[PDB]
Amino acid sequence: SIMSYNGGAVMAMKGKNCVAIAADRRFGIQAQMVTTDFQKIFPMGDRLYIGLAGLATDVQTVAQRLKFRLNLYELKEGRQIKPYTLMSMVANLLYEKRFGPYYTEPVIAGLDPKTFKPFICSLDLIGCPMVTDDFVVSGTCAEQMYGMCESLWEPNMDPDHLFETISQAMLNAVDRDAVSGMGVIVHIIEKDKITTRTLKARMD
Amino acid sequence: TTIAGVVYKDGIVLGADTRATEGMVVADKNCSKIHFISPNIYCCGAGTAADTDMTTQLISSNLELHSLSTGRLPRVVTANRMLKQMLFRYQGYIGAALVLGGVDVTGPHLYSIYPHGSTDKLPYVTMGSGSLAAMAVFEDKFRPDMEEEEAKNLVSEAIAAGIFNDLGSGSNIDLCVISKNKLDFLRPYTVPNKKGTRLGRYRCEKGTTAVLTEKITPLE
Amino acid sequence: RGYSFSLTTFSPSGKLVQIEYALAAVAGGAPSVGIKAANGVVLATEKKQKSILYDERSVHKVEPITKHIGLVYSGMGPDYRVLVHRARKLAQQYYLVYQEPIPTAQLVQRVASVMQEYTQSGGVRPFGVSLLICGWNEGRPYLFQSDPSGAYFAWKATAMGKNYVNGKTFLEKRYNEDLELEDAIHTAILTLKESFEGQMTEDNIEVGICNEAGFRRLTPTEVKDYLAAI
Amino acid sequence: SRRYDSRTTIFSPEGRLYQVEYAMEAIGHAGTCLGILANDGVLLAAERRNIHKLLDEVFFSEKIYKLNEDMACSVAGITSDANVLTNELRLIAQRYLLQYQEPIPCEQLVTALCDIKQAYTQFGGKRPFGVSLLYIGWDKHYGFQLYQSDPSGNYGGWKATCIGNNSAAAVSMLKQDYKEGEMTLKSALALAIKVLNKTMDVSKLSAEKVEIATLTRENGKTVIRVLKQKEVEQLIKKHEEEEAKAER
Amino acid sequence: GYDLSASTFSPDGRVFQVEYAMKAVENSSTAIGIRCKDGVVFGVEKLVLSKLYEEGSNKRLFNVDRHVGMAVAGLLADARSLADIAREEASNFRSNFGYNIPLKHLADRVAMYVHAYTLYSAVRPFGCSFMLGSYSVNDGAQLYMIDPSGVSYGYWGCAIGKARQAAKTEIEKLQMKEMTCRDIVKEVAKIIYIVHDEVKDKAFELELSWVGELTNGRHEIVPKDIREEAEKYAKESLK
Amino acid sequence: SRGSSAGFDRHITIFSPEGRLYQVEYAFKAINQGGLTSVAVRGKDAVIVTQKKVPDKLLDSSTVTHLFKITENIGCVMTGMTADSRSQVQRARYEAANWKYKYGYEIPVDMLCKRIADISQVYTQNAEMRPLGCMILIGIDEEQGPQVYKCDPAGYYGFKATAAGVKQTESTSFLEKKVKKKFDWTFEQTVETAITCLSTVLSIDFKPSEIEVGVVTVENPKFRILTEAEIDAHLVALAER
Amino acid sequence: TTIMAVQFDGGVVLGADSRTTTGSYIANRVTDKLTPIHDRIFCCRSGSAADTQAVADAVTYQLGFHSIELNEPPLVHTAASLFKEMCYRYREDLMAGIIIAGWDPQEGGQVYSVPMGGMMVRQSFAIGGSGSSYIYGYVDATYREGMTKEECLQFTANALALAMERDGSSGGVIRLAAIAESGVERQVLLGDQIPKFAVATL
Amino acid sequence: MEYLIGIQGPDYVLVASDRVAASNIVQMKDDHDKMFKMSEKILLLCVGEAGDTVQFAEYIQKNVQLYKMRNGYELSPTAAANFTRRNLADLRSRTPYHVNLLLAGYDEHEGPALYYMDYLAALAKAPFAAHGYGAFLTLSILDRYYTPTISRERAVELLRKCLEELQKRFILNLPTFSVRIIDKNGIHDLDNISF
Amino acid sequence: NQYDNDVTVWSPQGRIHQIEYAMEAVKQGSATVGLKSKTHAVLVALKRAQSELAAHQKKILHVDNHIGISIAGLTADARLLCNFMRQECLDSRFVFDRPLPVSRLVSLIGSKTQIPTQRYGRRPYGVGLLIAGYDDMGPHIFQTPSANYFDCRAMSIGARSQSARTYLERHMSEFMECNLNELVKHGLRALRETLPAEQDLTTKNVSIGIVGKDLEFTIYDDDDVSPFLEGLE
């Protein structure tokens, strides 16, 4: 598959007044690992990150054009972007290449800068918006991640236990995937701070 | 994917499932397949979800032009023409097979639009993977000029049969009621499928997952 | 073919003399007044209606753009309908891109650019229309005024058209910030009464408001409800 | 047709372009706007024209325009031409930040916009834009900078300059009082309002008064901040105190 | 002034370039056409400016379709261009809609093409007026006339050129509705030799063509003996 | 001011020192140069009546018409220059058949006259062409009954009764006095009032070959152009009063 | 899919089935297969479901505007030539064999077969669709020159009922239309009203 | 197939490249230079499908020189590598450039920078990198012995062990190897390592 | 005054002054004469030197084997029209495999020169032509600025050409039955009517074009003009 040429796996999960987003760190070519510190989660605001898995060159292409459009937006308007508007912008940007599609399925996890309601969503590779209230996952080990998150998620969690469940979900999911893993970063988005953590993971 | 519609005495009743699958895995549990287009026209979208998403954005936008321009509420046949012209212009490469249902000044209408731009006018429609199971219930039980509640129970039963007898559908029944005198968007209407109760508890305490680095970034 | 040279050229005092003539075309138009209240905005305008043969339901001067953005003018009608069709065409492209009702500042900054292009492009005259665009978003009301030069200002209360200097003096006398919208309509009708000359009815003014409920024109029976008090 | 063509893009009998000169005559009536380059930052100090009572004060700025994360600009002239050019400025700066993944050096933006303003003075038969723009901005190559542009397409680097109304009389004081290489933010804020008390001869100064914004570096991040009403009223009481102490 | 451009109204509401082109029409020689019972007959006073010219030079009768003929007046260089526009328009109608173009629709296509130049400063109005005649079994006979302003009407008998009013006066003396076309040739040749100014422009030729029942709707030139008999009859009636 | 002029503001569509457009003002005189007058009025069941001049006996009177059929449900009378009139009728036919093709239903009357006005504004803004110096529309809207619309060369446009051409203002004043007598300011004798209004300001007392009448009705929504004997019957029924 | 038009003296009789299948599942069993291109001109749609509705809107547009300008009821041959041009111009992206039938005052009742290709040929009767192969031999044997209107309605109903019996891709109700100077008279034959032919039992 | 290797140190980058140009069974050039100087502090290493390499590298190289002509100073290696990535990604057009790249540069604010890039234009910054089928044989030894604080002579020894693995195990005749080091004093050429 | 600056301005008499000024460009140029028999067509033209050793600009262009033209006026406009007629006869040969008839080709030129006489910013072509050709219908002499064109038995355009028109009006009765030798001599005397009285027709300044049934078109220059120059008078 073209999605699985670089591997990669990103998930988001909603908590009480906080969201968590975590992405794998392996940058791969089908069998050969190249580096182990590949950045997939990019900041698009104070309390709003976007995560892009899939073909690792399309992650950087879509993210550079997205930052190009978003900086013009935030300079022309004079406010930070609300996450639903960022979902519509990324769906527009991917759908402009409908028959020439980018091979990335972005996930968006952040906080509304005024209401501080938690928001998570994912997309397909061509721009179907999927707003869910529990979790969204994306990448080559999607079955492992739905299997972990369907059993481990419980509503209304504090950021500590949300960190615990998304960390156990990532670490138990990627160790059954050959072409993903090799380290994981975890971002906890809170109202008053951002917590950036990396985990002990299998390096095989 | 199981959506349906009927023409009853005062308007249109639309229904849907909520399960959206990618590959052979359930991706979404509460996906809304009954699109807003006009205050009177709603458009159930089956097939390729992103293509019908951008199509029921764009035609909704053009009807928001047109209703403000003429100052009147739009007709069904206007959205029908715009849909069939765009979907014929792209020759079916938009993989959206639509149910365009609405009530205008000439009463209710129900159109089924195939992706290449062929349109049918129907008293009842079913689309998607579970279209045949709900079509069975419609051929068994539909009558012309039904009342509101009989049409609501008929569409809900047909969506239920398409939920139980297909793998490609499940987990909710949304409805919609469209008439001259009312608009009733019943989301959800009946929930035939329920998550089982988890017997064990797997709550990992603090310190269960080892941490290598940590950075606290304060905000205002 | 179309000309390619501009007709708006600099006078030796630095004045774009076509714009300063189009502002006199604005000053001869039918008077219009907009006031930003605390809980919303009111727009009201005189209908320049002689000739009882006119069917008043055929034309509207207060014309909405979105569910909470509308606008009114003073000056030439057929340029105003060009600006309304273009403003709707811009707001719906915004709604296609971002899936959001357009910010009022983001519609003014585009409509003002469309009015700017005709003061510099080839073979066109500037518009003869000064606009008043109102909006309610971020739980805060807006009032904007665009000119034929393409410049835009943010107002709390203003007046344009015939005798607008005395309208601005009457507004600076009668404005206070705590005004409720039902009093904001009343002050606007008292402002338009200064130069009406000829027995105001429900058929010869047009009043629009925007609030939390949205933008709507007031039906002539609701116009007669306030004008019975005036 | 040829009867109506005003020929805005031809030479004079002396080698002048009359529309480019008449643009500068339009600039000569625009608002007094000065900017002073200091050691730890740059300011801009301008006269607001929005001085009637009934205005709304909607935006954070009237004539100050953020162009990217590292630069700001002021304008003077026609408002609408300024809006069009600063939209072009933002498009150029974001095309560069798109293409190289680093923010644009401050001079490339100014020479690009002077290319755009120079093109309309030569061909196309349009009228030229009648605006001056003052340019502040920080980069990692030369730090805090200042520029001034005109409708002809010229630019230069300055440490203090003034455009708009009463330009030469303000720059005459700026030649006098500029401490080259020693100015702070606070001494520059003192000097700018010292000159603006000397050039605002219409409606001797009252509270809302100006727009004044500074560009500074904090913790490796560039901040452009418009001073609040409370900050400017305290600073102008400090200036009137200094005018009181000036004699004895 | 107010007359250097076709895109400028005068203070009184006149467009002077068109009304100056209508003076250019009535500089040129006489062409008349008479509709009758079963067809249309055209007649043109064809000047020959010098005896070095071959027969058939400067034809002023054009065929614009195989069932439609045309008679022109005015600046002939424009009239050949409008003949080629009418030829292309009738060709496109036969190709698209599969049958011969009705003359009402053909005249209202060519009238819109003529009118399209009386709006713009980037062109000048045509300096020519023209008639279109035809016959078919379904439509009867039809004769429409266009002037440079672009306005077309259906006619019983028309005259265009520098001798317009005297020729219309003499046409109105005629009972054209009930006559055979063989009579109409002699009656047209009468009026052409009546209106001729022999002292001012000297050498000239008679040019005649009919379309009607007697050619089964095919637009043809009058045969040589019938033209010479009409010339003899009319020159003896000149007396 | 008061008739001031700056350069080419009497030659193209640019603003005077007062804010008037002189070529658009001069385009109204071209309607009077046509030398005709038309009257339109609607009741509860719309009618347009115009003159018919036959100065030349050579004309085929089947082809001289100022009543045009725009679509099957909407008719129209023009006034002014004749070639511009047939141009704007061709343009209204193209927009009315384009609306049906894009939107799937017969075009409204007000959405036809707004479209023709938005076309005609472009000639009052671009400098390189002249405004068309010449339209009254009638048709049954399903909800409002008969409609009467009048667009003019400046781009404006909604009437109960109107006039066009040379005797515009006087016939307007006659209809303005007559509406005050009528109940609910609305007419009853639609076919007859137009004939009285046309014969009053002109003082001709017309022949049936001198006027042509078109009616659109709630019983027959099709635009229908009357025969000669019917207009003669209405003229004689008015003659015996 | 079985459409049929029969020319008689004074007009034409059309007929069509009502079954539209996708694969071997009946997607619509009350499909209306007679499209009015003008008042008294009907076109029939067999082949690709998109194209025969997509071209017909363009031809309805051009023919309506043409009829407004020419101030006449439009010809049937004009409506056939507007298909013969267009279905030829896009013939590699269309799969459209159209049977145009109708009436005009000038040449009477007319049936034009426009087969897949963008040509045009007038016939005394035309059959089309997938099912027409099973009723070529019936209509070559039964057609007599100059049948009345009722004889033709029974002939169209019999020839359609045979093809609906034999072809699996055809069925439903028989929708007839008789287009003449007096107007269009449509009728639907359902259930027992469809002409019945007993199976060859024993 | 062509071989690339680069090692990024504390204040230096060591790069090496094979010096062979082949055709289908035979090599036509045994002094082939794949190291293209972009500017005073940046080299661009260019292997892959023939034709696309030298055209793409020189088209980047004239813009890297052109920025210096317009501005009077150098591109940073981050900006030049992102510029090269943008031009290579701009792929979903007609024109393919099937090139395998390494960019090594020294910035005068960030120090040594080494960038890996495949023909997809996936840009990955790494402490060491290698192209070719010899990368599969030598990146494991690089993971065996590399530390972040390797001094430059130990880096020559670790490179020499990798080149001896190319001689011992790899089936293509790769006998001669050119090496350069980029520092704060510019680009330094070293002696050719031969077998 | 104001109506002489644009071709797209009708003067109030119903004329176009920029079209009538273009005919002065044909009324100043070096005169030429054409004529025909029923077998041949002959062009005779004055060759123009700036005074001398610049050796006498050609007036007669080899346009095909079967058509030659003569020039009087703006020479680059006639060379434009020569390349146009070259392209039209070559497209007719490439499509229909027969040379284009001359009467259709001159109507194509009349169509081409008409278009700048109507559209703003353009000028009329300032050249009049004599076109000599042979096709199935026999020999032809045509004359074309104002886009009108003429069929001609014998024709004289250029400076002072009315005397040559008078001579050809006198002697046009003979021309159809004169052979190829006499036919060119008539036109040589026709041009020699126009000349200065001191100058005569020599091997310098007189060109001759000849086309006939059995003879493809030949321009006659310095050496080849000598037989027809002999036995004149």
PDB file of C-alpha atoms in Angstrom, chain A residues 5-6 27 29 32 34-35 38 55-58 60-61 64-65 100-103, chain H residues 82 85-86 89-90 92 116 118-126 130 135-136 139:
ATOM      1  CA  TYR A   5       5.256   2.795   2.653  1.00  0.00           C
ATOM      2  CA  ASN A   6       6.433   4.986   5.541  1.00  0.00           C
ATOM      3  CA  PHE A  27      10.219   7.497   9.761  1.00  0.00           C
ATOM      4  CA  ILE A  29      11.007   3.152   4.071  1.00  0.00           C
ATOM      5  CA  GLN A  32      14.573   0.177   6.342  1.00  0.00           C
ATOM      6  CA  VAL A  34      16.014   5.764   8.648  1.00  0.00           C
ATOM      7  CA  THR A  35      15.522   7.983  11.717  1.00  0.00           C
ATOM      8  CA  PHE A  38      10.258  12.238  12.914  1.00  0.00           C
ATOM      9  CA  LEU A  55       3.088   9.140   3.520  1.00  0.00           C
ATOM     10  CA  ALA A  56       5.696  11.202   5.356  1.00  0.00           C
ATOM     11  CA  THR A  57       6.382  13.486   2.412  1.00  0.00           C
ATOM     12  CA  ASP A  58       2.695  14.383   2.161  1.00  0.00           C
ATOM     13  CA  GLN A  60       5.262  17.900   5.236  1.00  0.00           C
ATOM     14  CA  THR A  61       3.669  19.108   1.982  1.00  0.00           C
ATOM     15  CA  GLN A  64       3.569  23.614   4.807  1.00  0.00           C
ATOM     16  CA  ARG A  65       0.619  24.660   2.633  1.00  0.00           C
ATOM     17  CA  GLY A 100      -4.761  13.737  -7.177  1.00  0.00           C
ATOM     18  CA  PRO A 101      -4.975  12.992  -3.490  1.00  0.00           C
ATOM     19  CA  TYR A 102      -2.423  13.541  -0.793  1.00  0.00           C
ATOM     20  CA  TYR A 103      -1.695  10.384   1.149  1.00  0.00           C
TER      21      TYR A 103
ATOM     22  CA  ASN H  82      13.535  23.178   2.447  1.00  0.00           C
ATOM     23  CA  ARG H  85      12.503  19.803  -0.875  1.00  0.00           C
ATOM     24  CA  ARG H  86       9.855  22.182  -2.223  1.00  0.00           C
ATOM     25  CA  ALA H  89       7.979  17.869  -4.164  1.00  0.00           C
ATOM     26  CA  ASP H  90       6.560  20.290  -6.733  1.00  0.00           C
ATOM     27  CA  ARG H  92       2.512  14.963  -8.645  1.00  0.00           C
ATOM     28  CA  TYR H 116      18.401  13.061   4.251  1.00  0.00           C
ATOM     29  CA  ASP H 118      14.583  10.295  -0.851  1.00  0.00           C
ATOM     30  CA  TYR H 119      12.845  10.572  -4.226  1.00  0.00           C
ATOM     31  CA  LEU H 120       9.528  11.296  -2.493  1.00  0.00           C
ATOM     32  CA  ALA H 121      11.211  14.460  -1.058  1.00  0.00           C
ATOM     33  CA  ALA H 122      10.662  13.218   2.481  1.00  0.00           C
ATOM     34  CA  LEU H 123      13.033  15.442   4.456  1.00  0.00           C
ATOM     35  CA  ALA H 124      14.528  13.890   7.590  1.00  0.00           C
ATOM     36  CA  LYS H 125      17.361  15.413   9.611  1.00  0.00           C
ATOM     37  CA  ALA H 126      19.629  12.683  10.977  1.00  0.00           C
ATOM     38  CA  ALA H 130      23.466   6.741   3.738  1.00  0.00           C
ATOM     39  CA  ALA H 135      23.377   1.698   3.200  1.00  0.00           C
ATOM     40  CA  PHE H 136      21.690  -1.577   4.191  1.00  0.00           C
ATOM     41  CA  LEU H 139      24.049   1.840   8.672  1.00  0.00           C
TER      42      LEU H 139
END
